[PDB]
Amino acid sequence: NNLVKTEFTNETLDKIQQTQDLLKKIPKDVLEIYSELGGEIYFTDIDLVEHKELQDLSEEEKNSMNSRGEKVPFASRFVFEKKRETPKLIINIKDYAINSEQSKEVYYEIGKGISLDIISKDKSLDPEFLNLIKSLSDDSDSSDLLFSQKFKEKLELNNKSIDINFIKENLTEFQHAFSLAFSYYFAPDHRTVLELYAPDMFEYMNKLEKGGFEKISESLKKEGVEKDRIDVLKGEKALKASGLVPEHADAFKKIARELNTYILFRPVNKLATNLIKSGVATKGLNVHGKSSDWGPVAGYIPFDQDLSKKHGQQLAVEKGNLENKKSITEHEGEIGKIPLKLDHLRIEELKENGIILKGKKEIDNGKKYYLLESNNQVYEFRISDENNEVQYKTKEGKITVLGEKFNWRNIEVMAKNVEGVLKPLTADYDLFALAPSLTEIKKQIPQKEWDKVVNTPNSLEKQKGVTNLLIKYGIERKPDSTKGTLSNWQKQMLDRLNEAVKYTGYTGGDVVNHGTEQDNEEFPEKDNEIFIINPEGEFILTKNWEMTGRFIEKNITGKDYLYYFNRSYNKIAPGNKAYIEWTDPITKAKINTIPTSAEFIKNLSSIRRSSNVGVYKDSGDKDEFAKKESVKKIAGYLSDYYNSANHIFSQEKKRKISIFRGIQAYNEIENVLKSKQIAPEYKNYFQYLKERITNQVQLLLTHQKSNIEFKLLYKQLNFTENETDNFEVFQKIID
Amino acid sequence: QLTEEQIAEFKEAFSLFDKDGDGTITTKELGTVMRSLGQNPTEAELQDMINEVDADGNGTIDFPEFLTMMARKMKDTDSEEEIREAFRVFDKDGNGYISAAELRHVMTNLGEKLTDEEVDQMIREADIDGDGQVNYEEFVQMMTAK
Ligand SMILES: Nc1ncnc2c1ncn2[C@@H]1O[C@H](COP(=O)(O)OP(=O)(O)OP(=O)(O)O)C[C@H]1O
Ligand SMILES: [Ca+2]
Ligand SMILES: [Ca+2]
Ligand SMILES: [Ca+2]
Ligand SMILES: [Mg+2]
Ligand SMILES: [Mg+2]
């Protein structure tokens, strides 16, 4: 942010050697304060009156406290400040003179002050005893009742001990005094007048030059970013909506740091958090039932699907069960069902959370039962006493959507195996992603391989060699027996997370069972809120799919951390046929790129599968083949553009030899597009290809000479019979 | 199992270069059908696939015989992806272009001390069109191009 602005380089080295002499006398900070304060100083030519491109109506003259005395004769000023949002210092200079009668510069100096007073310290953090007390020295601190310079028409008031009692009433007035205090401390003539008269304000400003200015200039700097940041809720504000179990998050806090890598989770469901801390295991890959969000079973994965989020959906239940059953059938011994048991605490929670209502007791077969209530009108629930098991049945006047009707039976929830014993299953921690630092990945490659590579003489080879390393040891993701599809370093990162919450006192197994949702290529899910745990150890929770994609560009992406995004973004996800958008750089530059031989052929292939008509039909029409021969012709140029032997030429040439290569391509395109009947589906694609080639060639121009335009350069050629001098022409066409 | 999509492409290309429009292609032709598809088997590795199916005028392959050959080399590799991720990595800033500035800035974190001289070097030999920077396109080249 360049603070100084000279509108006219008119006058010689005297307006300049004069504007300079001015500014170099102000502390490099008083400015760095004015800058951060969004201020800008205006050094134009002669513009006395309201003629400056900023001296119009906005926030001008309203009340008359105006100079080193008031006077409000606007027609007689050369320095001005546009007070309201951003400060705008506007100054002009006429012929050679400020150094004889300096009383004229003492203004461009104070005239400023009101740039930093009210925002300085006088009122900048708030009046702080620093200034407040320094003001009290109206007359009773130092044996110096000398302040006939800054305090008269408003402050000939010795009669009332000046403190918090009334210092507010006249904020502006205590400015008219700080501003002179500043004008005097820097005025190229009267320096001591201050030190001589007022003994404090001197040492005040003095300590400001000593560092006081580098202060605020750093309380605005820091409150510069933390001011215009990204709305994220941090601390235990987010960790709340997050879902993770607090003791766990914190537990994680350690690994993020140690291993220096960002961890990002999708929403863990609330109705499972305690269950987790409670000891309930988590849903792994082996189970695909739906959790439940009502009744006791809530937060558990009911064996009956009509007791989970899909209550009523005749099909998702009639297909939900299919899976639970199989889940046990297949992976028997590890995946089973066990009777529900809402422990003591869990109850008092489904209480205020608003899920159940405990009441009317009852007896049946000689055992005590507390009729657990709920508003759901399809089942009745109740919990035992000895063992607090839970049971339900259909009501005396209703039926199941599947069509079943049963009496009191135990509510079996799903459960996996953990140390020989089956524990009930609940929501797990699904990672939205893991951002390790690029350095941690370097610590991932074995010291000898990465050593055996940088010795390669071939520089180009050394780049490749390295990349494949980074790829190899940190980007590649393969499948895995248990933990789904993830990276190796990712796996080790997975355990360290679990073993972490294991020492935190968990007893239900792991809490992170599979890889990062950024590999959920098949059925990708798009969550709004995303909890994060930075490398420092803070907690952040984006609010938008955008924010996230943004909080990540800003901290994970462009900050030496390694992140990769879902291969299915900006495409339709097979599984759920979903389209989730994510800013992809590469694609952000396709607009200006001459397609590839193969990217081109690929495109045709595509359209052929859709209009069921190819760029050229397999017929006998000598018009068709012409079109054929002609695409082959582009499929030629296009790849000729990207010829690797372009290394033996010099930059200049490259752009040239290519701006042409590409141009030839544009040609033949043009040709075909002005041919026989080419389905209007290609008509368009081919049209799109043009804009590109064009764009790419324009880019290859702005790197070299500047006025030359495509449309024109092209016009000026002759692709009739000979390409001979056409090219030589093209050279001169660039002078 | 080459995906249908992955097939229509090998025909839209297999055919696009079958000059005498029949249904088989010459050896040289095969090389071209390939390169165009983005690949370039050695002027000698190009005959191993073809020599394996000698039931023609000896030096020609139809469509169905090519649709197969595209296994020996393709039923394993899935690297095109990764290489595009790596790219997004060096392209630190987000300009879809990899500047020499960042080439170095990333080359130094993975532990390699590069000379502000030899970086401009690579970046140079990687750029094919002169803009002094590298894009995914030329980047893919640099890499895979063995
Ligand atoms: N690396 C991976 N390998 C295998 N599966 C993965 C991987 N990363 C993510 N997944 C799949 O992502 C899935 C997450 O989607 P989803 O189950 O809809 O989440 P949820 O919102 O936490 O709960 P629901 O079960 O849907 O109620 C579960 C998991 O099998
Ligand atoms: Ca043929
Ligand atoms: Ca870049
Ligand atoms: Ca380039
Ligand atoms: Mg799930
Ligand atoms: Mg899961």
Coordinates of all heavy atoms in Angstrom, one line a residue, chain B residues 97 127-135 138, ligand 4:
Chain B
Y97 N -0.5 -22.3 -13.3 CA 0.8 -22.3 -13.9 C 1.8 -22.5 -12.8 O 1.6 -22.1 -11.7 CB 1.0 -20.9 -14.6 CG 0.2 -20.7 -15.9 CD1 -1.1 -20.1 -15.9 CD2 0.7 -21.2 -17.1 CE1 -1.8 -20.0 -17.0 CE2 -0.1 -21.0 -18.3 CZ -1.3 -20.4 -18.2 OH -2.1 -20.3 -19.4
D127 N 9.1 -25.7 -20.2 CA 8.3 -24.8 -21.0 C 8.5 -25.1 -22.5 O 9.6 -25.1 -23.0 CB 8.5 -23.3 -20.8 CG 7.4 -22.5 -21.4 OD1 6.4 -23.1 -21.9 OD2 7.5 -21.2 -21.3
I128 N 7.4 -25.4 -23.2 CA 7.5 -25.7 -24.6 C 7.1 -24.6 -25.5 O 7.5 -24.5 -26.6 CB 6.6 -27.0 -24.9 CG1 6.9 -28.1 -24.0 CG2 6.8 -27.4 -26.4 CD1 6.5 -29.5 -24.4
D129 N 6.2 -23.7 -25.0 CA 5.7 -22.6 -25.7 C 6.3 -21.2 -25.4 O 5.7 -20.2 -25.8 CB 4.2 -22.6 -25.6 CG 3.7 -22.6 -24.2 OD1 4.5 -23.1 -23.3 OD2 2.7 -22.0 -23.9
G130 N 7.3 -21.2 -24.6 CA 7.9 -19.9 -24.3 C 7.4 -18.9 -23.2 O 8.2 -18.1 -22.8
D131 N 6.2 -19.1 -22.7 CA 5.8 -18.1 -21.6 C 6.6 -18.2 -20.3 O 6.2 -17.5 -19.3 CB 4.3 -18.3 -21.3 CG 3.8 -19.7 -21.3 OD1 3.6 -20.3 -22.3 OD2 3.5 -20.3 -20.2
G132 N 7.7 -18.9 -20.3 CA 8.6 -18.9 -19.1 C 8.0 -19.6 -17.9 O 8.6 -19.6 -16.8
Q133 N 6.8 -20.2 -18.0 CA 6.1 -20.9 -16.9 C 5.6 -22.2 -17.5 O 5.6 -22.4 -18.7 CB 4.9 -20.1 -16.4 CG 4.0 -19.6 -17.5 CD 3.0 -18.7 -16.9 OE1 3.2 -18.1 -15.9 NE2 1.8 -18.5 -17.7
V134 N 5.3 -23.2 -16.6 CA 4.8 -24.5 -17.0 C 3.3 -24.7 -16.6 O 2.9 -24.3 -15.4 CB 5.6 -25.6 -16.4 CG1 6.9 -25.7 -17.1 CG2 5.8 -25.4 -14.9
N135 N 2.5 -25.3 -17.4 CA 1.1 -25.6 -17.2 C 1.0 -27.1 -17.1 O 1.9 -27.8 -17.5 CB 0.2 -25.1 -18.3 CG 0.5 -25.7 -19.6 OD1 0.5 -27.0 -19.7 ND2 0.7 -25.0 -20.7
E138 N 2.1 -29.0 -20.4 CA 3.6 -29.3 -20.6 C 4.2 -30.0 -19.4 O 5.2 -30.6 -19.5 CB 4.3 -28.0 -20.9 CG 3.8 -26.7 -20.3 CD 4.4 -25.5 -21.0 OE1 5.2 -25.7 -22.0 OE2 4.1 -24.3 -20.7
Ligands
CA4 CA 4.4 -22.3 -20.6

